[PDB]
Design a protein around this ligand. Structure first.
Ligand code: CA
Ligand code: CA
Ligand code: CA
Ligand code: CA
Ligand code: CA
Ligand code: CA
Lengths: 175, 174, 174, 175, 175, 175
């Protein structure tokens, strides 16, 4: 059973989506879902001593402009295990390009951690934290010779619009 | 596949049951199985800085009075990963109510760790450890405004009887 | 040497104080400084499966109404090692009594983590996090039969006033 | 779906194989795949305070002389999670017997960690590391009264031959 | 300040002694106190993938037949940091010889963990645990070519007698 | 006692030096020795989600052109604790500038880990590992607006010469 295809995008789209976590915060190993089987697979070991600053995964039943499931980053105090489902509230979106591809990523908080009850938009996140995430994506592939361009951060409304676009793109590609 | 439905309750019930672990000891995140997919799902982050004192999960193909699979707590020296199957020997049962529901939980040791070879009943467990488990369940939802009531501990014999009842309740509902 | 006596209270009191950390966030072991040697010493293992929600220590060259150095709690994203000095900005104070003693504790953020640059007062802290800290101190000695009473939280201004008093109390006693 | 039966042995066998990891480096718990449901199962807790010195698993769709899937050991700098697939390059083979059975194990490195780009054969591995692996297997069941016999190490060519033999054995047994 | 020389052996010898921890449970690095400065020093990395099964250290102001401070092993549920003092109750003693030297080690529990309130003698410890400790010391230096002989376990009374002997030996050597 | 002033540079300089570790591998917290009390102090939290790729510290009784003790990086398989002394063999040197200052750093391996017995010079280190260390230092202060310049790597002979120069500089400054 491939979780990417089997799970709905969320219980109350786009206000609450499912995040299917692939990479826990603190990992230098970059995991992805095997397309065929839906098992966790090692994509690569990051070439530099950086760690994922957030729990990182995908939204089920989405497709994006870069030809992959739509990425989501969830701020967790204690990281989860790979292949864990988290009910997440989108609060913003990171706009970036990776080798000419649109590789934007939703930023979200868990609905069921009261610590984040008042985080509802991109302005609620400490600025240094947004910078640390952006810097990670700016440099994590530098030793692989890849250039990424960070364009900036969009707000919750923009994140939600993009989620709806990605849901539609999945329906068209696979429907 | 959904492990809860596919696995037998145990290889030698009720002396040895399977525990399907959801939450490793040391976790502040509370995980459950997604009913539709069988994937691990975050239920909540505990509101207080407490950690699960035991590896926590369910016995497959059981059903209990609180409308859930029968809970089991396994004492592991090194915690396992979520969705790991452990062969476990029941040694007692924690009697508690949660918001008016009978929410009893089996206490068990792993068959394949020789450290626990001589643990066969509730009297073999250090008292302080039983107290720490009871205290966790007494207080872990306090900030959510929920009230739990700890009745006490039953012995291995009582635990095994409850397991049999839960196995029967499952067959009846499904 | 005994760090408690040798270090100044801070580089810019009371806006920036030194926190000498005894217990990293995540610890169930409660450490204290040995008075005679200044070495880290195990005070006790918490009776319940709770972990310190903050990096916990003392402000050097302070003394408080409960006959101990003034306690300080520092919010660290990655916990430090015991006996590490942190430059900390006080942002509030937890008011509590422990067995009849005024056992108030400063809440502070590290000056050198830009994540907390905009945390300057108690109102900047998520409410759930204040609750989790208060709940820990309310219940962490329950199984030892001790009673703690949480009064509430004071703001940064009140915290800084108490720090000044504690600095004065130290000079007076020593 | 049982991953052992569902996954191919690898993408470019025998030069690159899939390792399906059961036990991460550092574990004292010995896990195995429940060959009924494909779930991870605790086989035992090692009787001694030893930890697995490598990420340990199996090559899918293989069968070996000892009546189990072919074992594979992958050298990872950061351990992976159980049930993770790693693309691995075989560089040697540990020859050992366990209770009279031929219990040989492939030694491999991850293709996607550049740290190991120049490890291509058994001679590239520090001698002390080979010794630590062999010692683990020599002694890890001593308190269980089990007897193992370490014969030595074979090179990459020998490992690859054995992988092909194990792939053929699976086909004959299950095909 | 050298903690080995500055701290008393304990607050209520020999019923309660100080354990000065050098190596936390779970470490493959073997630490010791630098004789000159009293700082922690790496002695060696264990040649095999074994971890210390107990928090390991010394009793201050003791000297033993093997020309070192008297060793103590403390059973802790959560390991402490190196150079931490633990008030410990001796419950037994491991009798062993290392290359002809008497290298006996006290086994103790922390006074301030109620989990161990009823552990007062060697018979209170699960047998498998005693075996795992003995096996560790039997094999941890095998790849270094060293032979150790495990002679057995003595009870709490014997442990206490040896503590008193070691305290006297320190007074004579340094007094 | 301040360990920086109290400890000798090493037991057989410059072939074997003491590394006094301040920051264990894997730390995002940057620690330094309070050169007043000798206690560990938090210098900063790195602004980016990078971790120290090596155990990092200083050689006691040295002084360098940048007005601080001579830096040393030790490759450890299992990280040590802060303020631990490691006996280390220099195998190379990283040449870099930080804010116009000569901020060179010794690269070394532990003498007492047999894994590294055959690492004796910079050419023995996997190229990808040298790159990951250099990249860390190139970028770890980028969000602080600081500029570093990585010049390259020198061999063991050059490292040893520099160690002797730093020992002499300390003597002239403090002796
Ligand atoms: Ca993408
Ligand atoms: Ca229940
Ligand atoms: Ca106090
Ligand atoms: Ca085999
Ligand atoms: Ca000894
Ligand atoms: Ca420098």
């Amino acid at each position: 059973m491939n979780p990417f295809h089997e799970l709905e995008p969320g219980p109350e789209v786009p206000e609450v989506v499912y995040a299917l976590i692939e990479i826990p915060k603190g990992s230098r190993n970059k995991y992805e879902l095997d397309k065929k089987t839906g098992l966790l697979k090692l994509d690569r070991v990051l070439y530099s001593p950086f760690f994922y600053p957030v729990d990182y995964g995908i939204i089920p039943q989405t497709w994006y402009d870069d030809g992959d499931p739509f990425d989501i980053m969830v701020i967790m105090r204690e990281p989860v295990y790979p292949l864990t489902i988290i009910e997440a509230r989108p609060i913003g979106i990171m706009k970036m390009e990776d080798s000419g591809d649109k590789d934007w990523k939703v930023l979200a908080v868990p609905v069921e951690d009261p610590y984040f009850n008042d985080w509802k938009d991109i302005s609620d996140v400490p600025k240094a934290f947004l910078d640390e995430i952006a810097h990670f994506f700016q440099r994590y592939k530098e030793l692989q010779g890849k250039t990424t361009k960070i364009e900036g951060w969009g707000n919750a409304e923009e994140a939600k619009r993009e989620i709806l676009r990605a849901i539609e793109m999945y329906k068209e590609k696979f429907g």
